Amino acid sequence: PRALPELWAQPQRTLEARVTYLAADRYRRPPQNRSLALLSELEKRGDLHQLAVAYLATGVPEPSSAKAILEGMRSDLRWQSADVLCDLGVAHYVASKPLDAARATEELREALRLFDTVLAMQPGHVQALWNRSLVYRDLGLPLSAMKDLTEFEHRETDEGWRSEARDRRARLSSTLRRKERWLAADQTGADLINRGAQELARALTFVDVPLLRRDFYHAVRARTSSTDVLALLPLAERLDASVGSGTVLADYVHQVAARDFSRRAPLAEQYARLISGRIPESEQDALLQRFLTSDETDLALGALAHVMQRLPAYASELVRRTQHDEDPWFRVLGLQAQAMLERQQEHYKEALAPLEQALDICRRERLVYRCIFIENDLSHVKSWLFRVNAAAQHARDGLALARPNQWDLEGVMLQALGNVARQAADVTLGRAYYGEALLMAEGDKWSTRNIHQNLAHLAIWALELDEARASLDRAMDTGLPLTQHGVAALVDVARTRRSPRDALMVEQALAREPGNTPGQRAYAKFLHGRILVEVDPARGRMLLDEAIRQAEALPLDDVSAAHARAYSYTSLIFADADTGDFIAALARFGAELGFETPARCVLGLTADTERSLLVARGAQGQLLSAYVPLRSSRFEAASMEGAVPPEMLAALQACTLVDVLARPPLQGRSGLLPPGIAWRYRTRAAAPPPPAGPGTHLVVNEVRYSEERNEVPLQWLPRTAPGAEARFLRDLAATPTQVLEAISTATEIDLATHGKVDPDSNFAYLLLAPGADGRDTLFEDSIRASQLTGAPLVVLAACEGSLPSAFLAAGARAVLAATHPIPDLDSSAFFGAVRDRVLAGASLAVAVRDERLQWLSAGGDSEWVNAVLVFE
Known part of the structure; x- marks a missing residue:
């Protein structure tokens, strides 16, 4: 497998990245055709590494072909795994460039994951360091890119590559200029507070910095004379002109420049010392009460905003005292305090309205310092509500607002983005954002501890418990105690990597929270x-x-x-x-749901972090257990093959039907047991009693969705019960209102629609025809709220935050759902045969098993019929 001189003879390197092929990895100056015969020559001659590297590093890049070749090469041993993974990351990075930001983020995440793997299994991979610096730079994380380039110049030996890395790092080092400008602005604001108009000349050069408005607020309240407040007027006017047409900060100056300072002067200095932090915590309350009992309300607002972080009982007073404030700054402050008070009682849904009100106010009034905090709070609230898309959008908006000038606030917004990624279980991007924020928050101890707690949580998700232990130690090394976030991380970590100070630290952290x-x-x-x-x-x-x-x-x-x-x-x-008490395990499995565990033919499943348990009883009542105290990977792939040991499968193959008590998140998955075993997901003590009288079989088929939905209507040939009715909802009649009306009476429900989860809210719904309001969804909350008087057997074809659970809670006596695209109208035949079988007298689980056997024995599709799950 020789190299081709013609492919790599160019004087200019085509791509910024570095490929691992030796001939294509030599210093060529950075950037500003291939033959179908001589690529086929490489393909036939066995040099597929050069084939991929040529697809990537010469001519017009075609990352898809190189990607295919590299995935093919991943399962081969003639190539270094590190080199193949680095080249795959390079292919993903090259594919990221043409796409837009929303789609480029996914490719950058894949490339970052591959480079992280390469550098984890090879710490000194120079190509991986170079390419990860490029990926970090493309993600808007210049500090991480500079860190990678420093490690590169440590590890690189070629002179030209070291020189180019030095030049790239020098170019990236312009972010420190923004950092130093922010530091100068902050110091100028502090001096403005402490001296008044003596630093007025310097303060006017920082008007575009968002913090200057709050530092002006602090400066005006700290002046002990009317002359000083008059002297601050030019800054007020120039700050007013920079945000809008109307003047508000100049009216505030005139307001404070008329009050009788014979009473304000003793209190202005007290406010200044309170802001500067000279007041001890015990002394703060008396000063606060003195502030609140005076006619000077601005000092009261400032002190209340300063104190409410430690004492949330003063947030109510702040909210009351700025409901109708003429300054939109303090109105947004009060709305933020309202939202935080709602959050402290876990009323996150109710905390949204003041947050959106404040967002609108601050967006119209063009005051950025409060907008950044409002966007951070909105991102946190929506991430808590599992609206990761909107939370990420709010985090991006706040980061864009804070990027040019606010160094600390943009680190806060990077922490917000990392939190959004952590909620979505995005370990790679969460780690990237949190590491960038940690690099930006150097010296700070409060943000460092929170960042390290979140990093420990991300490591816990990835089952890297040693790295979680290290990050928890780093968080506690800041000298600040952990919070309940850190306590959750610790109780997840202290089980296997306990430290002598773990229990004592948990006691301290839970004592104050x-x-x-x-x-x-x-x-x-x-x-x-x-x-x-x-x-x-x-x-x-x-x-x-x-x-x-x-x-x-x-x-x-x-x-x-x-x-x-x-x-x-x-x-x-x-x-x-x-x-070793596995009897108590099954006893608790049953006791959680409110019913005694079955004495035989039962399976229970759990998996918390690194421990898995599968305890079962066979036909004779004998107990079998599969305890994995130290796992290496979480259950995934949405199909649980191999979880049940062959001995347990042999024990459970003698059962008529098996009740599976799968605790979350293991509930609702397919492929847990072989097709030859009849089983069900038991979630209730007993099914609702059957109704009396001939029921109304409801069929919702051939639904005409909206134009933008792009879904194929599904036909259904039902099997009505003897002397029943076939209540049909076809075409535009299958509206959410009509469907909700119909399902509350029907005793047999066949839903030939699509059940999809909302990408934003992560709520499953029933895709139906647009109604009068134009909505075309039936979210699961409406189903749970509804009551099903007929105790129906719901057949839920094309299912995919669980509709079967919602229908079972509503009153359905059993829900069987196909978690796979419908196989061309044979779903009707399968489910009708199942219904006829259960009408004969068989139980639901054994009837669906018999139909599964007759379906696989008749040449039917296996991937679909194995995804039919029975819920009871």
């Missing part, structure tokens, strides 16, 4: 029990039991209480499995 709501108190009880249960079984078991009891006393809409109960049951199940 016990929880505002009863659900948060239950969650803190859970966390304490979870860390404690590993060391002291009796006390930790008691704490987990009482956390379960506390969570059971609150409504099911309490998110923290539900999390506390579910996680306490998970911890107790795995603590019973850890000591």
Whole structure:
């Protein structure tokens, strides 16, 4: 496999990146055809590495062909795995360039993941360092790119490559100029506060910096004389002119420049010392009460905004005192305080309205410092509500607002983007954003601890518990105690990598954050029990039991209480499995759902972080268990083949039907058991009683969707019950309102529509025909709220935040859903044969198993019929 002189003879390197092929990796000056015969020569001669590298690094790049060749090469041993993965990352990076930002982000993420893998299995890969610096630069993370280029010049030996890396790093180092300008602006604002109009000449050169408005607010309140407030007027006018036409900061100056300073002077200096931090925490409350009992309301607003971070009881006073403020700055501040007060009680959905109101106010009034905080809060709220798309959009908008001048706020917005990525389980981009924010937040200790806690959480998701341990140690090394986020990370990590200070640190962290709501108190009880249960079984078991009891006393809409109960049951199940008590494991499996576990023919599944449990009972009642205390990868691929050991499969092949109690997130997955075994997903103690009288079989088929939906209508030939009615909703009659009306009476429901999850809200819906309002969806919340009096057997074809769970909660006696695209109207035949079988007298699970066997034995599609799941 020789090299081709003609392919690499050009004096100019075609691409910025570096390929691993030796002849194509030699110093050629940076950028400003191939023959179908001589590429076929490389293909036939066995030199596929040069074939891919030629597809990438000469002529017009064609990253798709090189990508295909490199995926083919990944399963070969004649090539270094590091080189192949680096070239695949280069192909993804090259493919990223022509696309738009939304689509280029995915390719950049794939390239970054490949380069991270290469540098993890080869720390000194010079090509990977170069290409990862390029990828970081393309993601708007210049500091990470400079770090990579520094490591490159450490690791590179070629002179030309080192020189070009030095030039690229020098070009990238212009971000430090923005950092130093922000530092100068911050110091000028502090001097403006501390001296007034003496720093007026310098302050007027920082008007475009967003922080100058708040520093002007602080400066006006700290002046002990009327002459000083008059002297600050030019800055007020020039700040007003930079944001809009109307003057507000100059009216505030005239307002404070008339008050009797015989009473304001003792308080202006007190406010200045409070802002500067000279007031001790004990002394702060008396000064605050003195502020609130005076006629000087601006000092009260400033002090309340300064104090409410530690004492959220003053946020209510701040909200009251700026409901109708003539300054939009303080109106947005009050709306932000309202949103934070809503959040502290876990009313995140109710925290959205003041946030959007403040967003509109600050967007119209062109005040950027408050806009950045409002966008950060909106991103956090929507990420908590699992609206990752809108949260990411808000984070991007805030980052764009804060990028030119606000160095600290743009690091905050990078943290917001990392949080959005962490919610979406995006480890690579979350790590990239958080590392960039960590590089930007050097010296800061508060942001460092939060960044490291989030990095530990990201490592926990990726099952890199050593890196999570390291990042938790880094977070605690800042001298600040962890928060409940850090405590959750620690209780996930301290199980296998316990540290002598882990329990004591958890006690301190939960002492100061016990929880505002009863659900948060239950969650803190859970966390304490979870860390404690590993060391002291009796006390930790008691704490987990009482956390379960506390969570059971609150409504099911309490998110923290539900999390506390579910996680306490998970911890107790795995603590019973850890000591070898697998009877208690199944007992808890049953007890979580409210019914005693079946004595035979039952399977239970759990998987928390690095531990997996599959305990089952056979036909004779014998118990089998599959405990994996130390996992290496989370359950994925949406199909669980190989989870059940062959011994357990042999035990469960003697059962008439198997009740599978799959705890989340393992519920609703296909391929758990072979097609020869009849089984069901049991989620309730018993099914709703059958109705009396001939029912109305409802068929929703041939739905005419909207033009932009682009979905194929589905036909259905039903099998009505003896003496029943076939209530049909075809074409435009299959509206969400009519469907909701019909499903609440029908005893047999065949839904020949598509069940899709909302990409934004992550809520499953039923795609239906557009109604009068124009909506064409039936979200699962409307189904859960509805009641099904007929106890129907819902057949849910083409399903894909679970519709079967919603229908079961509504009142359906059983839901069988096909989690795969319909195989050309044979779905009707399959499900009708199943319905006839259950009408004969067989149970639902055994009937669907018999039909599965008769379907695979008749040459039918296997990928579809194996995805039909039975819920009861």
